[PDB]
């Protein structure tokens, strides 16, 4: 459209993405069904027990945002919770959102997070990327300036670093500032990512197009290993090609444009003189973080 959409009309765009694919006809063998079931798993853990504690609407609840595509699936399924919590159920002009930026962040990454923003209607808190601190200090430092802060919504799966253990709310570690951790994503397999991702039409990273399914930083981060082009390998197959066909049509108000990435970041990928399937088409989760340089 001729201006950005307003925070309601993003909400109602997630609600109305969501109960579409929530209506597709899918075998109960199927990688779209196992997404139904992890959306209404996340859906009981933001409708249920979440916002009857913490209100989304006051700065009691902040959402960690680093624009990388299990963030923004969770954005999308938040924004939907808020609608139907609110709306459709009858239980603000921005979503105060927090960024811990760092100067080895992917230019593209750096500009998505710019981009999405505005579509999003995100009030965007970011640490300064050229001071050296930890995670927790930033936190702290993001703590102080909001103390009206109680809870925080991270995009963490059971299948990243150190997400064996994790639950969908518990506190902090005494070595980090005193908040709870909301994880309503948890139980989200790469796959379930990818189709739901794919399906809703919304933009992602750019970096995601050209063979990485991992965000690390600029230095150790690659395309993936197993995404590389070969004429000698069997080729790779489309798991997902269904839900790019009949992603979720847009009007005059949800309309969204493409982005190229960072001129910064192409040169990159070009020097390396391989070619990549995009992420989407890696869905063993194993296999998410094989794109990395080799160290020690
Ligand atoms: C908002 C938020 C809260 C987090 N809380 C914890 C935590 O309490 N304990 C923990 O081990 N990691 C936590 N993490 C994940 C860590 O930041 C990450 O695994 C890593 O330890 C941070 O690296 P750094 O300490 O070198 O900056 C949290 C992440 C986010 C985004
Ligand atoms: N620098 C940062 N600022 C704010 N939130 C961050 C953050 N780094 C991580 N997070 C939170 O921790 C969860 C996992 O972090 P990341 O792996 O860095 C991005 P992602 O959205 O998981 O996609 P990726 O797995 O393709 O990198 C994110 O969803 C986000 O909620
Ligand atoms: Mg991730």
Same mark, same amino acid.
């Given at each position: 459209?001729?201006?950005?959409?307003? *925070?309601?009309?993003?909400?109602?765009?997630?609600?109305?993405?969501?109960?579409?694919?929530?209506? =597709?006809?899918?075998?109960?063998?199927?990688? =779209?069904? &196992?997404? &139904?079931?992890?959306?209404?798993?996340?859906?009981?853990?933001?409708?249920?027990?979440?916002?009857?504690?913490?209100?989304?609407?006051?700065?009691?609840?902040?959402?960690?945002?680093?624009?990388? #595509?299990?963030? &923004?699936?969770?954005?999308?399924?938040?924004?939907?919770? *808020?609608?139907?919590?609110?709306?459709? #159920?009858?239980?603000?002009?921005?979503?105060?959102?927090?960024?811990?930026?760092?100067?080895?962040?992917?230019?593209?990454? @750096?500009? $998505?997070? +710019?981009?999405?923003?505005? %579509?999003?209607?995100?009030?965007?808190?970011?640490?300064?990327?050229? !001071?050296? @601190?930890?995670?927790? +200090?930033? $936190?702290?430092? $993001?703590?102080?300036?909001?103390?009206?802060?109680?809870?925080?919504?991270?995009?963490? %799966?059971?299948?990243?670093?150190?997400?064996?253990?994790?639950?969908?709310?518990?506190?902090?570690?005494?070595?980090?500032?005193?908040?709870?951790?909301?994880?309503?994503?948890?139980?989200?397999?790469?796959?379930?990512?990818?189709?739901?991702?794919?399906?809703?039409? /919304?933009?992602?990273?750019?970096?995601?197009?050209?063979?990485?399914?991992?965000?690390?930083?600029?230095?150790?981060?690659?395309?993936?290993?197993?995404? %590389?082009?070969? #004429?000698?390998?069997?080729?790779? !197959?489309?798991?997902?090609?269904? /839900?790019?066909?009949?992603?979720? #049509?847009?009007?005059?108000?949800?309309?969204? @444009?493409?982005?190229?990435?960072?001129?910064?970041?192409?040169? !990159?990928?070009?020097?390396?003189?391989?070619?990549?399937?995009?992420?989407?088409?890696?869905?063993?989760?194993?296999?998410?973080?094989?794109? %990395?340089?080799?160290?020690?």
């Amino acid at each position: 459209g001729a201006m950005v959409m307003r *925070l309601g009309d993003a909400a109602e765009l997630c609600y109305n993405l969501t109960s579409s694919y929530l209506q =597709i006809a899918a075998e109960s063998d199927s990688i =779209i069904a &196992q997404t &139904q079931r992890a959306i209404n798993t996340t859906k009981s853990i933001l409708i249920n027990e979440t916002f009857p504690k913490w209100s989304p609407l006051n700065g009691e609840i902040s959402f960690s945002y680093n624009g990388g #595509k299990d963030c &923004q699936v969770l954005l999308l399924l938040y924004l939907s919770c *808020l609608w139907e919590y609110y709306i459709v #159920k009858l239980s603000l002009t921005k979503l105060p959102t927090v960024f811990i930026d760092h100067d080895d962040t992917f230019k593209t990454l @750096e500009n $998505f997070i +710019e981009e999405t923003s505005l %579509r999003y209607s995100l009030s965007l808190y970011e640490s300064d990327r050229d !001071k050296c @601190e930890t995670m927790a +200090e930033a $936190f702290e430092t $993001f703590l102080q300036v909001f103390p009206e802060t109680k809870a925080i919504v991270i995009g963490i %799966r059971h299948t990243d670093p150190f997400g064996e253990h994790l639950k969908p709310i518990q506190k902090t570690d005494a070595n980090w500032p005193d908040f709870y951790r909301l994880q309503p994503l948890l139980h989200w397999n790469l796959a379930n990512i990818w189709s739901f991702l794919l399906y809703s039409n /919304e933009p992602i990273c750019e970096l995601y197009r050209y063979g990485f399914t991992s965000l690390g930083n600029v230095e150790e981060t690659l395309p993936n290993p197993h995404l %590389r082009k070969d #004429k000698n390998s069997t080729p790779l !197959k489309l798991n997902f090609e269904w /839900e790019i066909e009949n992603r979720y #049509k847009h009007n005059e108000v949800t309309k969204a @444009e493409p982005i190229p990435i960072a001129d910064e970041d192409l040169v !990159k990928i070009e020097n390396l003189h391989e070619d990549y399937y995009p992420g989407w088409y890696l869905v063993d989760d194993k296999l998410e973080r094989a794109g %990395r340089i080799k160290k020690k």
